[PDB]
């Protein structure tokens with residue numbers, strides 16, 4: 001399997017972090033809590049975010065059911081955008097696609113978003129669908145891996161991943177908890193989309209983007225409370241534990257070594273790191289765990305500062321940032337994600 | 353890919369269609385519509401269903417969050433039950449599984465169920481997890497078809513599908529409107545797992561089940577409203593068009609014909625039919641359009657009568673029934689499911 005295109009899309013409204021935070025302490029009911037808000041919004045190392053709605057409008061998003069309706073509607077719009085983008089990048093057409101997968105965690109669609117996306121693009125009635133849901137922040141790297149798995153049974157085939165994540169819209173569930181506030185500091189809105197072709201298909205089509213050689217999942221024992229949704233009348237409420245960072249610190253070198261020893265490669269063999277931006281404490285703990293020098297990760301940081309945490313979408317935006325800055329050809333690349341599980345996923349790549 | 357193990361798990365308490373009606377007509381807010389209730393409950397051709405919760409508890413099950421957490425607790429239980437049974441039947445062990453696909457439309461689990469089930473039975477930490485939401489009633493055929501798609505490219509592998517539908521628990525979204533009541537008369541609670549194995553590993557574990565040969569998805573354009581959920585503060589409220597049947601009548605034969613030709617076969621080279629029991633009106637419509645004899649779909653008719661509509665999991669029950677009845681060796685079976693999309697999935701099989 002060979003990546004033929006990468007494209008991200010973002011909502012038209014962008015605000016600076018402090019615009020956001022300025023309006024946000026003035027929100028219904030947050031003014032008792034304004035200091036820990038500013039403190040966290042400020043250590044978050046996000047410089048702006050995209051919002052699928054005008055900033056003005058968020059305090060009137062207290063109904064879950066309205067929020068999710070708007071999610072359906074907005075989410076397709078943007079997934080359609082990034083897929084047109086990647087297919088252009090991949091010089092291809094929707095008629096071409098033999099498998100679509102969608103990944104989200106910030107809304108509940110039925111029919112699922114791929115259904116809606118195929119409907120919109122005039123995808124071939126027989127397209128195989130794969131609506132991945134509860135995967136979270138890991139689904140960017142897991143999606144690429146699921147695609148690879150596909151194009152391994154179906155060489156001559158074309159597969160897309162689309163990821164929409166509209167983290168703003170989850171706002172009916174925000175309370176002034178530390179964990180809700182943390183994500184209030186971190187999350188933004190955006191989509192991304194990855195076209196990839198099986199090995200037979202890559203020549204004919206001229207596939208640009210890199211090879212997808214392998215992936216490994218790593219699921220942690222008794223770690224469900226690390227990341228999750230408390231789902232209810234309020235919608236989708238963050239569970240996000242402090243323990244997350246020290247797990248990484250403790251178990252992450254080993255996921256990497258086990259996955260790279262099967263290739264007889266070392267950390268030193270990675271030409272480019274493609275790593276999910278959990279936010280400052282998560283990037284550090286990565287960088288510390290595998291002891292990377294500040295530049296292996298500069299593009300993940302530069303993504304987090306620019307657009308904030310786009311959940312599963314961020315790792316693909318960032319993948320796109322690396323493909324462009326055009327790495328040492330025939331070198332190795334490692335995608336690295338984690339989400340609800342708790343799990344990690346690693347994706348082995350080789351540039352052109 | 354070759355099935356090795358199928359298994360349905362089911363909530364301990366079975367209730368009569370009649371005692372379920374006679375209790376349901378006394379539920380807070382229902383006695384006024386007793387008459388339509390009786391009429392839809394008798395009209396449905398379902399003689400008993402299992403419920404996850406005792407019957408008399410459902411009137412108190414008014415909060416989505418309470419329902420959603422009850423779901424997660426019980427769905428895991430029931431899913432690992434299904435799974436372990438399939439494994440046994442395949443004679444394999446939780447550790448041998450190299451990817452678990454997971455299937456629900458009935459609860460919102462993050463971490464996902466596959467995540468949870470995998471901790472429960474201890475699958476390897478690097479099991480490949482494939483969490484499907486939003487395929488709903490088509491998921492039983494859909495999931496078996498992505499099992500093959502996986503195993504095509506992994507001939508030594510083991511992949512499992514685990515379906516769990518706990519329709520009951522949607523009760524907080526239930527109000528006495530017609531589509532909703534139609535729901536209270538068909539849907540029951542249960543779980544199926546399939547254990548599949550790839551082509552070279554079939555020879556080894558000596559895989560008993562049907563060989564999985566092919567799949568055709570078929571997504572009907574502009575039918576996103578025929579069925580799915582209006583998701584809200586109140587939970588998962590069913591959307592179901594009275595138009596659904598009519599589209600099966602119209603568009604099914606061609607879907608079946610286009611697929612068996614590709615294969616050089618006929619409606620009548622089919623050894624056994626495994627159909628989704630969506631409604632007697634559905635089943636008729638399917639038999640009507642395919643101009644099948646009454647025997648073709650008897651196990652479906654009986655599965656409906658015996659444990660209700662179990663959304664995705666129903667077909668996998670009917671598929672275990674079918675295996676059990678042993679259709680003529682080396683003949684061809686056909687899986688046929690329908691659901692939110694609107695779509696159909698066909699799965700071509702070959703019985704031992």
Ligand SMILES: CC(C)(COP(=O)(O)OP(=O)(O)OC[C@H]1O[C@@H](n2cnc3c(N)ncnc32)[C@H](O)[C@@H]1OP(=O)(O)O)[C@@H](O)C(=O)NCCC(=O)NCCS
Pocket residue numbers: 391392393395396489530531534537538592593594596629630631632633634661663
């Ligand atoms: C309802 C059922 C039990 C049979 O019902 P029945 O009482 O013999 O006859 P009908 O289907 O005509 O239903 C009676 C009335 O309810 C209406 N109705 C039936 N299903 C309806 C729905 N899903 N939404 C709205 N109205 C519906 C009918 O239009 C009819 O109304 P009318 O008398 O006002 O014109 C059932 O078999 C059915 O029709 N369901 C469809 C199956 C389905 O959709 N599959 C589920 C997905 S797995």
Ligand SMILES: CCCCCCCCCCCCCCCC(=O)O
Pocket residue numbers: 105134135136137167168169170171174180183184185187188227228229238239311339340462
């Ligand atoms: C401005 C609104 C953002 C504040 C609310 C944060 C909502 C996003 C939190 C979920 C992030 C998605 C992935 C994280 C883990 C998960 O729950 O799956």
Ligand SMILES: CCCCCCCCCCCCCCCC(=O)O
Pocket residue numbers: 372376410457487488489490519520521522523526532535536537539540579580581590663664691692
């Ligand atoms: C006392 C018993 C009540 C039983 C449940 C009544 C409401 C059932 C709602 C069923 C929804 C079925 C959804 C799945 C199939 C689909 O969406 O594909």
